[PDB]
Every structure is written in C-alpha cells, then in structure tokens.
Amino acid sequence: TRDQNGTWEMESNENFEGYMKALDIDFATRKIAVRLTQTKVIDQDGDNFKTKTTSTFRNYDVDFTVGVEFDEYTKSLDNRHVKALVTWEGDVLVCVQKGEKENRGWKQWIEGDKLYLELTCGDQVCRQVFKKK
Amino acid sequence: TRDQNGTWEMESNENFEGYMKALDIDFATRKIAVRLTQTKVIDQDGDNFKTKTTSTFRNYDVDFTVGVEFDEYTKSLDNRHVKALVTWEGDVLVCVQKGEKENRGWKQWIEGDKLYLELTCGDQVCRQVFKKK
C-alpha cells in the first residue's frame, strides 16, 4: 500500500478553485484549469519518486484502415456522424468526412522532421505543424 | 514519406478558431481549446492507423527522495520557492512546503483501487480522487 506506481486519471476534484485562490493564480489560469481532467503518472522506486502531472481537456482517438469507409462519430467535438474515407494521394494522407457539413476533411503529410495537418470545414482551413518527440 | 509513426507535439496552430466556429462548436469551448498545445500519437503498420490526439494545457513534474529536504521552484504555477520535505505518515505520503504560504503541503495515499490526493494551503483544502488506469 506504500507502492503508488502506475497511471492515475482524476475522477473528482473538490475545492480546486479555493486552493488556487490561496496560492494567488492569475484567474485566467484558474478558470482554464478549473474544468480540466488531471492525470498523474508515478514512478516510485522504494523511496525515489518521479511524478509527472498533466492537465488535459479532451483526447480524441480514431482507428481506420486506408481505403475502408467507416462511420466516425466525432464525440467530444461536434458529436456528429460522418461517412469517413481515408486514402493516399502520393504521400499525403487525405480524408473526406461525408456528413451534414460540406468540405469537411483533413490532410496529413510529413516533410523531413515535421508532420503537417490541414483541417478543413466549409470555407475555413486550419493548418497545424507538429515536431517529433 | 508514408511512415508516420511516433509521438508528435504541436508547435503552431493557425485558424483553429475558424475550424471550430464553422463546426458550430460552443463558444466557451473554443476560448479554452484555442490556447492548448496538442499531442498526436500515431501507431502505423502499413495501412493500419491508430491515432490519439490529446490536448494539454500545463505540466508539472517533481522528483524527490523521501525524507531528504530539497528546494522546489514551482514554475508554471505560483513561481515561488519552498523548502519541501516528503516523509511517510504510516502509508500516507505527506509533504510539507516551508515557504511564505502557511499550512502549505499535500497528503497522498492509496485506498483499495483509488489514489487520494489532498492539497492544503492557508485555510483552503482540496480533495482529489484518482482512478487507476
């Protein structure tokens, strides 16, 4: 019962606002982290501790096979059903999400050491660049 | 290249407000998600993809030895210095943080299958429960 190893997901959080008010936190950071699920990973070796605490919102996951249509229920996002299809266009992973919203989809490729992702919906395009870890 | 395995972290994000406003995502959600760095984990085996898109706000790690005093500079929080000491009270990991704030510290123990974290500062007490993953 002294070995507290493992990954821990927060399920309840009581009086977190008051604890941050007593520590004098810049309000904006308080209201951001007041409704975020914390996750603590503990690496304990007898008496040596290596703990890592993260504060996250929503983690979105999806599994697919390139070329196989699948019904994607984008929960946590817009909560809609879309007929999703992912194909290869050269070395660019392209996906089309057939649904109520038109021009919905995303591109994803890799140039060198960075991964690019261009989300598209209607007439708005979001571009994201990711570095490797 | 078509190989997209690994864990990537975002370093830029443009027009994310446009992609979320066009998706009819609620306003208060856009205001929070627009200032969070995302992380994408990709497991690829040919044309078989298992992706995980998480969104983190702030992280805070700390490494210590039970019983040994050490100086903790709580960056990304209140950015103060505390002379912290961690010792066992039975099976409850207790830490006192000698600093400007009085009654500052935390207690942490394992009961059954859940982690129990109790943060204290001044006259405010925070009670947190964590489930095992």
From Swiss-Prot, chains A, B:
UniProt free text on domains: Forms a beta-barrel structure that accommodates hydrophobic ligands in its interior.
One GO cellular component, as annotated: nucleus
Gene from which the chain derives: RBP2
Function: Intracellular transport of retinol.
Any Gene Ontology biological process: vitamin A metabolic process
One Gene Ontology MF term: retinoid binding
Name under which the protein is recorded: Retinol-binding protein 2
Keyword Transport: yes
Tissue expression profile of the protein: Higher expression in adult small intestine and to a much lesser extent in fetal kidney.
Family classification: Belongs to the calycin superfamily. Fatty-acid binding protein (FABP) family.
Subcellular location: Cytoplasm
Organism expressing this protein natively: Homo sapiens
Residues annotated to bind all-trans-retinol: 40, 108
Organism placement in taxonomy: Eukaryota, Metazoa, Chordata, Craniata, Vertebrata
InterPro entries linked to this entry: Calycin (IPR012674), Fatty_acid-bd (IPR000463), ILBP (IPR031259), Lipocln_cytosolic_FA-bd_dom (IPR000566)
Keywords, ordered alphabetically: Cytoplasm, Retinol-binding, Transport, Vitamin A
Residue pairs linked by disulfide bridges in the UniProt entry: none
A Pfam short name: Lipocalin
